[PDB]
Design a protein around this ligand. Structure first.
Ligand SMILES: *[C@@H]1O[C@H](CO)[C@@H](O[C@@H]2O[C@H](CO)[C@@H](O)[C@H](O)[C@H]2NC(C)=O)[C@H](O)[C@H]1NC(C)=O
Ligand SMILES: *[C@@H]1O[C@H](CO)[C@@H](O[C@@H]2O[C@H](CO)[C@@H](O)[C@H](O)[C@H]2NC(C)=O)[C@H](O)[C@H]1NC(C)=O
Ligand SMILES: O=c1ccn([C@@H]2O[C@H](COP(=O)(O)OP(=O)(O)O)[C@@H](O)[C@H]2O)c(=O)[nH]1
Ligand SMILES: O=c1ccn([C@@H]2O[C@H](COP(=O)(O)OP(=O)(O)O)[C@@H](O)[C@H]2O)c(=O)[nH]1
Ligand SMILES: *[C@@H]1O[C@H](CO)[C@@H](O)[C@H](O)[C@H]1NC(C)=O
Ligand SMILES: *[C@@H]1O[C@H](CO)[C@@H](O)[C@H](O)[C@H]1NC(C)=O
Ligand SMILES: O=C(O)CCC(=O)C(=O)O
Ligand SMILES: O=C(O)CCC(=O)C(=O)O
Ligand SMILES: [Fe+2]
Ligand SMILES: [Fe+2]
Ligand SMILES: [Fe+2]
Ligand SMILES: [Fe+2]
Ligand SMILES: [Mn+2]
Ligand SMILES: [Mn+2]
Lengths: 700, 700
């Protein structure tokens, strides 16, 4: 049993990047001892992510190995650090190295790189990997020194070609007992073997298994174009996220805060923008520490921005607007806003927030700053669907692809802070990162690629992690796909696409409490029920949309009312069908009115059928009253739409068989009464002003 | 101006018949002085209604004229008496006779009788009547004596041939100044001139006018086959019935009563016979003075007669039944019953009453006896129609014909006691008339003619008047045309044909009072109404007719009830359609339920549509309850059909949204409640016995 105190891990790292720090954490998890070579220096090995190189690694190792040229008691493993994580303990590692009977064991891979012609010189292996990979090897210090001391080449010569040529010396291979880890018992190189690797979970740690050879590798190496796949595994292996401990590096359970540049982007017509702009005043972060930047590309939203701008300017430390007259593309506007923070040393954090992002968590900015990341996004999902503001994987064309764990994250089965290839709509970026690591201005722009994709590729090309937190509930994403803007109030028609936000804006606030009972619903007359349904904004926008139509009812117009032996009781009204709002109003009936009817009349069942839906106008100049009648309905919904006293003087509804009068209707509230046989009723005259009501004859 | 005290009316009458007494009354109305010849004697003039004769009249007149052979101061008018009425005063008569310039003026007529060949010997008259009629003439006593003293012929020689031959003597006609009343200024003979005579009304007397000559005759002579036409005129002229005085000989405004033989006839299956038989015990006449005779020709009514016979035998002085086993024809049974009274001197009055005669006036027998007629019928009419128990006129074939005043009598515009050619269904006949004037037994029988027609012709052939009184409301006639007898209770199906009687037997007695208000209708639960609808006989016969069908509901049977989200709430029941009683029950809904619904729910209008009508049976052995549900109806009718406690133990109806229970239903009463949305309700379990209810889902 080889003593673990005789094991030394040597790696190269010219800067303490997020990958290197990820490698170190995995090493400290198993109590390895690591020696890092080249931390202060500048990288002369060339563009290794692009071509061959890395000879500077060998040179540094050869110098380090001269202290250990005679230490037969020492085992030494060399690994890369930016694209490597450790999955197993030193004890299992040393036991597996002894089992190989080798004195210097290299990793094996599927490709003969860089010189593909040398493939013939390699020994034949039946089913394992055949060729050498210099990203990882382990052996005796004496044997390693005999190999690395033969280095005498340029800092930008290929390290792997150097090791490959020595291995392909049959006499030297036999003499020094050199071997390749063909079946990935120790080293797992991901390139060319992505379908062979799966996660293997445990209670408080995670590993990978090679399903082609049924092994449990110690070293995972995201070599070549497998950096993102390793970023995926790195979220779990070894203690990233575990079934019993949750995530391992997130905050989990939670004097002046840092100054922040808040950048808002309105690049398409977006619903409920006034509601968003009012939410900016509610974010729980000292506004004297926040600088607001708002790019509006839509002339449809200029009235919205203008209404809010006095409140915003009075709220934040400083504000700035770049409207549609500047003709900035989305990529030019995002480059400008981020570059405003980059060129301001007082900008410690840059917060980008898009128009379709609803932040239900008012502590989002704080939560994300405490995570102490370079780039981090909060998880936002389109309500009740899988689409969200991030990607878990990329296609070979670097377009969208679903990851093996995407659904578990969106559904918050596994919660934590995740390293993902793509984020959008809302993120917080360290200002220091913009100055020192992403100093160019062409972040979102420069190419034909989409601005939000160029932004993510810009950070990945620098090895910056894009973090995503579902540790908390942060909010949702609005559907903006087919926003119909040709209305006086286009957000009225948003009951199908954004029903959660439509309810918060238009349904009465105390509706839901009334639906659960507890003494809100009233019964002012026998079998007539009274409950809050619509909000004052819903009433005002519905009335206004009616007047904007203008074509009210006149003579020869017929309603489905019953008086005497004839259906000749009309009203001055507009039907939902005429204004194109019938389907929308029927949806309100199914969702909110129907369930209220089944609660108040136990035993009755409704699907909220209604062919007669219309708004009535009562005025002394034209028709101020409505004579007694029955409704062609099983039950009738009667909703006031304005204020008694402020907007009109006069009475409401009278039920004759009871001599009961609804003398003072309430604006948002609705009346529920049967339409046939028993509740013969009358519309008292409007003496001053104008009286608007909404009425549906449901279940005819 | 000739003195009326010099006028003498001479007529012949061997018996004080009703025609002679009718003539005398018209004469006493104008204060004539009448001398009647031959009152004690027997008629030897032959069958004058059949052939020629009347010479006995001339012989009696010739003897009477010998006292006045020299009285030039005396005017004498001779008229028949059985078929003559006087329409004018003696003053107008004498003035018109003087205007003629004649010394003996005969009546004129259209036919040359008896010898038609003598028509050539008559003088030519342009437009008036050409030939002589011996039924009436007026002239000086001296001139009349010179004519009548030439009589020397047989008592059965023709009187008119005698006068005709003397008139056709041109020398004698010129000598004595003989003339014929060509244009009916004085004498109106009806035969051959029926279209020339109309009634002319006045305030307190009536006349006739000749519209061919525009005259107002004094003497109306129903000569030949015009006796019935004169009977018609005799109802008015001269003071029979007047617009201001009403009738002139009727009773108008009303110690042992005479003994009566009451004869009941059941010659066809007749509805509501048990109700008739119970009414016999209610007639307001001392039953110890009435002898009952009942002929039943129908085996269908033997159970009905048997149920009533103990009460009848205990009620009347003596009873007798002649059932279907005797095989008596209707004519043989009516001959027998009348002949039982004829051969009993203690029978003072004979009362014939048929099965289809409903006597609503319990004093009918008294009223008709006080009229002191030989034969008199009360007027009975089929409800709401013109058909009644009498004819006002005859066809030339002596079949039915409508009289000029028939409708005014049936509608009781003119009320009185009328001399009509035909009566039926109910009449009272003096027993003395049967013994002395109609002694034969073949009254209804003897020929192929209908028994009721033979009966009337038998009395007309003897000059007996058939009187009809509409002075009071007496009753009605049942429709018996298409009585469907193939039912356990055929009177249930009588709602269309006899609706007045159907209501009195089957509709609850206090229904109508409840329909007018005054605190009968109850509201035991909110918007549930409770009122009496059916009578106990209706409930018992409806239940019995259901069990007699027997095929109650079982599994797989579906009703139009709503529970949860399914219409799977069944009952053990029978639908009206299965038993052929749907049309009948729908008529009850239209007539009695509908009007009650519009009264209780003001503003609602109904035509009582109902596709679901059925009787439910609740039993502990099979289905004793009904789970909560709604009705596929605008409102529901729920009528109990038996007694709580006597017939079943258990609850009734529970309305859940109100926690209101109809725990003790009343048998005949009905519940009225809405079927949808508000009155979710439950049928409490029947713990003992059997619970029957009738239910309709009206206005679905
Ligand atoms: C919803 O219900 C709340 C509480 O039931 C209402 O709040 C009250 O509003 C009135 C005036 O609008 C105040 O006088 C009370 O003091 C409020 N009560 C509380 C506890 O704050 C609220 O108004 C209702 N919403 C609407 C739209 O009427
Ligand atoms: C119709 O109404 C009358 C009176 O409202 C009812 O007559 C009463 O009947 C009860 C018992 O049935 C007696 O105790 C009362 O003395 C009666 N009152 C009078 C004034 O006679 C009659 O019962 C009702 N008809 C039915 C079928 O119930
Ligand atoms: O600027 C650099 C680039 C390279 N490296 C080290 O050189 C190794 C080789 O780089 P890389 O893993 O990207 O090459 P690959 O394994 O994909 O061939 C990295 O792991 C780092 O440890 C470094 O320290 N600084
Ligand atoms: O039994 C009789 C039949 C006849 N008459 C008288 O004779 C008249 C002639 O009879 P009738 O009127 O019937 O004959 P007609 O006028 O029709 O030819 C009657 O009016 C009676 O006054 C009579 O007194 N007793
Ligand atoms: C690592 O070493 C520490 C002592 O330095 C020890 O407490 C801990 O249990 C070790 N962990 C593992 C996984 O060996
Ligand atoms: C008939 O005579 C009486 C007197 O005897 C007289 O009172 C009456 O008015 C007379 N009637 C007529 C109609 O002449
Ligand atoms: O004016 C009212 O409140 C009654 C209106 C009404 O009943 C109807 O429009 O059907
Ligand atoms: O048993 C009852 O009274 C209720 C019967 C009922 O509701 C029905 O038959 O529809
Ligand atoms: Fe309308
Ligand atoms: Fe209405
Ligand atoms: Fe049924
Ligand atoms: Fe029911
Ligand atoms: Mn590497
Ligand atoms: Mn005559």
């Amino acid at each position: 049993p080889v003593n673990p105190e005789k094991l030394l891990v040597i790696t190269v790292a010219t800067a303490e990047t997020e990958g290197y720090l990820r490698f170190l954490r995995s090493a400290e998890f198993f109590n390895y001892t690591v020696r890092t070579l080249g931390l202060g220096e500048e990288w002369r090995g060339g563009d290794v992510a692009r071509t061959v190189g890395g000879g500077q690694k060998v040179r540094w190792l050869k110098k380090e190995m001269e202290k250990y040229a005679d230490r037969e008691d020492m085992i030494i493993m060399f690994v890369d650090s930016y694209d490597v994580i450790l999955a197993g303990s030193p004890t299992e590692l040393l036991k597996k190295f002894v089992q190989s009977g080798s004195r210097l064991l290299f990793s094996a891979e599927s490709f003969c790189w860089p010189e593909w012609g040398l493939a013939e010189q390699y020994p034949e292996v039946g089913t394992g990997k055949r060729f050498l990979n210099s990203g990882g090897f382990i052996g005796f210090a004496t044997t390693i020194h005999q190999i690395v001391r033969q280095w005498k080449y340029k800092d930008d010569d290929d390290d792997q070609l150097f090791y490959t040529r020595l291995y392909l010396d049959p006499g030297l291979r036999e003499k020094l007992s050199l071997n390749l880890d063909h079946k990935s018992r120790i080293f797992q190189n991901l390139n060319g073997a992505l379908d062979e690797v799966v996660l293997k979970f445990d209670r408080n740690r995670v590993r990978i298994r090679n399903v082609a050879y049924d092994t449990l590798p110690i070293v995972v190496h995201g070599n070549g174009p497998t950096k993102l796949q390793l970023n995926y595994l790195g979220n779990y292996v070894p203690n990233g996220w575990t079934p019993e401990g949750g995530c391992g590096f997130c905050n989990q359970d939670r004097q002046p805060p840092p100054r922040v540049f808040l950048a808002v982007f309105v690049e398409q017509p977006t619903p409920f923008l006034p509601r968003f702009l009012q939410r900016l005043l509610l974010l729980d972060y000292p506004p004297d520490r926040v600088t607001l930047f708002l790019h509006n590309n839509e002339v449809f939203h200029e009235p919205h921005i203008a209404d809010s701008w006095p409140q915003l300017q009075d709220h934040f430390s400083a504000v700035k607007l770049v409207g549609p007259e500047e003709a900035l593309s989305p990529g030019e506007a995002r480059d400008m806003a981020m570059d405003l923070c980059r060129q301001d040393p007082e900008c410690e954090f840059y917060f980008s927030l898009d128009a379709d992002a609803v932040l239900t968590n008012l502590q989002t900015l704080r939560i994300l700053i405490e995570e102490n990341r370079k780039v981090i996004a909060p998880m936002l999902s389109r309500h009740g669907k899988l689409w969200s503001n991030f990607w878990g994987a990329l296609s070979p064309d670097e377009y969208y692809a679903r990851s093996e764990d995407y659904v578990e994250l969106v559904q918050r089965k596994r919660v934590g802070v995740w390293n993902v290839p793509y984020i959008s709509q809302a993120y917080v970026i360290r200002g220091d990162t913009l100055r020192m690591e992403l100093p160019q201005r062409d972040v979102f722009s420069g190419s034909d690629t989409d601005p939000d994709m160029a932004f993510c590729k810009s950070f990945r090309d620098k090895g910056i992690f894009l973090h995503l937190s579902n540790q908390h509930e942060f909010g949702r994403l609005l559907a903006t796909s087919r926003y119909d803007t040709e209305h006086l109030h286009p957000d009225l028609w948003q009951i199908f696409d954004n029903p959660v936000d439509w309810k918060e804006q238009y349904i009465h606030e105390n509706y839901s409490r009334a639906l659960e009972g507890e003494g809100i619903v009233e019964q002012p007359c026998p079998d007539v029920y009274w409950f809050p349904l619509l909000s004052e904004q819903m009433c005002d926008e519905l009335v206004a949309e009616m007047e904007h139509y203008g074509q009210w009812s006149g003579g020869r117009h017929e309603d489905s009312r019953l008086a005497g032996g004839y259906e000749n009781v009309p009203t001055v009204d507009i039907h939902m069908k005429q204004v194109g709002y019938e389907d929308q109003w029927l949806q309100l009936l199914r969702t909110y009115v129907g369930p209220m009817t089944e609660s108040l009349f136990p035993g009755y069942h409704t699907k909220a059928r209604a062919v007669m839906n219309f708004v009535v106008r009562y005025r002394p100049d034209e028709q101020p009253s409505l004579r007694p009648h029955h409704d062609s309905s099983t039950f009738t919904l009667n909703v006031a739409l304005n204020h008694k006293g402020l907007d009109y003087e006069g009475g409401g509804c009278r039920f004759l068989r009871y001599d009961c009068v609804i003398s003072s209707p309430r604006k948002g509230w609705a009346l529920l009464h049967p339409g046939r046989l028993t509740h013969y009723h009358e519309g008292l005259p409007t003496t001053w002003g104008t009286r608007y009501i909404m009425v549906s004859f449901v279940d005819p």
